[PDB]
Amino acid sequence: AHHVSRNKRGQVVGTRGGFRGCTVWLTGLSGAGKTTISFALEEYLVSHAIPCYSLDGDNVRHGLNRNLGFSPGDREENIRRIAEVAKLFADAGLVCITSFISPFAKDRENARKIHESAGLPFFEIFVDAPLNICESRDVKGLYKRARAGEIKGFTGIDSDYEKPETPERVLKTNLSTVSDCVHQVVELLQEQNIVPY
Amino acid sequence: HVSRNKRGQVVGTRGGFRGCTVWLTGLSGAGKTTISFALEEYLVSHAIPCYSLDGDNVRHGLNRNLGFSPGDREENIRRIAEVAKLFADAGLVCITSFISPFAKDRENARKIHESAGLPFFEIFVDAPLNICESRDVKGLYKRARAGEIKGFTGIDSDYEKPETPERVLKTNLSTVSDCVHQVVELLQEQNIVPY
Ligand SMILES: Nc1ncnc2c1ncn2[C@@H]1O[C@H](COP(=O)(O)OP(=O)(O)O)[C@@H](O)[C@H]1O
Ligand SMILES: Nc1ncnc2c1ncn2[C@@H]1O[C@H](COP(=O)(O)OP(=O)(O)O)[C@@H](O)[C@H]1O
Ligand SMILES: Nc1ncnc2c1ncn2[C@@H]1O[C@H](COP(=O)(O)OS(=O)(=O)O)[C@@H](O)[C@H]1O
């Protein structure tokens, strides 16, 4: 009695043969672009017949992580539960795109060494945009509420964002287009033999 | 994101959206993990992508910080039911193989799938505690009566028989292959497994 192999799994998940289970881990300041890259990437893989799944704020915040507030331990448990689920989707044969700020190198390496110890590729993607560009963009109003003292401890304002030193890609969203950053990430997945050339 | 409409075209080779949760529930040693294994081998044979949540990939991973106190079981299932919902939303057939004895935990698990629109199949693996105790596949029934395990379900914790499940499986009264086929017929009826 055993579970089905990743090789059999690699043959039934998509129309294109081979295991592709990996995890694409976006990280960056609120408003740097993680959501917009995630859909764009997700539309790409789907349009090219690669099943994927985004984990993001909307489908985690109020489900699996609904009992997790904004204390340091709670944001930590937040990235832990996301990481163990991303591993499961990866293990399932899918490409799992996570779009969480994840400000501390120390939770990101734990997520990475959760994947690497199951033999699953892990791609730290640094969505890099100057904080003042993020504060200008203010997509959800958060920076204005952080200045005002109504959001206490906000990444980039009152708690730090530890920038990836050694990530597989860096996306300079203040300098290039959405399509351009996606090309950087699709090309990564072609090198690592996830997306066929 | 990409709708379930378009995920049905890329996930699997069979065409159509199939995302759902087969949720096996019943006594420790009643055949949940056996059915989950054989059903998995069935769907992968028929080219239906799937994924199992069992004790192994959960106990020490996602739910590693959950004890065996009442709040912690509620949470155990709560987190499992959320992850099933994700794998179901993704276009996979998620199979869960936990005792999950309390009925409100199961009602909550179903609520989470239906409100999102995902099919939830409650599958009662049914075998008399005596046979399950007799089978004692892991040693737990032998430890439990001694008191090595306190609160074990069937001994010092109750088990709440699901009263309107989509299937009951007489693991003491029919073969693994018969019980798996009962689940296949339920999934063919609901346009999850092609004919
Ligand atoms: N190259 C780019 N990549 C991603 N987003 C960009 C880019 N250029 C401009 N933007 C804009 O930046 C904002 C990113 O917001 P969002 O994706 O919600 O950030 P986060 O990555 O924090 O979720 C969007 O308004 C998007 O239109
Ligand atoms: N119809 C059946 N379905 C599943 N298991 C069965 C059946 N009939 C007998 N068994 C036996 O019962 C035992 C079930 O144990 P297990 O699958 O570990 O159950 P659980 O996951 O509920 O603990 C196995 O040894 C299996 O061979
Ligand atoms: N350490 C943190 N400090 C402040 N806000 C956070 C932190 N972590 C996450 N957020 C906020 O989290 C929401 C995004 O979804 P979450 O699942 O809560 O976490 S997040 O990491 O992506 O940001 C947005 O409201 C996000 O901007």
Curated annotation (Swiss-Prot), chain A:
Which superkingdom, per the lineage? Eukaryota
Q: What is the recorded phenotype of mutating residue 162 to K? A: No effect on 3'-phosphoadenosine 5'-phosphosulfate biosynthetic process
Q: Where is this region: Adenylyl-sulfate kinase?
A: 1-194
In this chain, ATP 1 is annotated as bound at 31-36, 176
**Which body tissues produce this protein?**
Expressed in cartilage and adrenal gland.
The portions of this protein that span the membrane are none
Residues annotated as binding adenosine 5'-phosphosulfate: 58-61, 70, 75-78, 101-102, 140, 153-154
Mutation effect (residue 27 to R) = In BCYM4; patient with premature pubarche and hyperandrogenism; decreased sulfate assimilation; increases ubiquitin-dependent protein instability
Spell out the disulfide connections: none
Look up the record and name the associated disease. Brachyolmia type 4 with mild epiphyseal and metaphyseal changes: A form of brachyolmia, a clinically and genetically heterogeneous skeletal dysplasia primarily affecting the spine and characterized by a short trunk, short stature, and platyspondyly. BCYM4 is an autosomal recessive form with mild epiphyseal and metaphyseal changes. Clinical features include short stature evidenced at birth, short and bowed lower limbs, mild brachydactyly, kyphoscoliosis, abnormal gait, enlarged knee joints.
Q: What does this protein do?
A: Bifunctional enzyme with both ATP sulfurylase and APS kinase activity, which mediates two steps in the sulfate activation pathway. The first step is the transfer of a sulfate group to ATP to yield adenosine 5'-phosphosulfate (APS), and the second step is the transfer of a phosphate group from ATP to APS yielding 3'-phosphoadenylylsulfate/PAPS, the activated sulfate donor used by sulfotransferases. In mammals, PAPS is the sole source of sulfate while APS appears to only be an intermediate in the sulfate-activation pathway.
Q: What's the family?
A: In the N-terminal section; belongs to the APS kinase family.
The protein, known as: Bifunctional 3'-phosphoadenosine 5'-phosphosulfate synthase 2
Q: Which organism is it from?
A: Homo sapiens
Name of the gene encoding the protein in the UniProt record? PAPSS2
Q: Parent protein range shown? A: 22 to 218 of 614
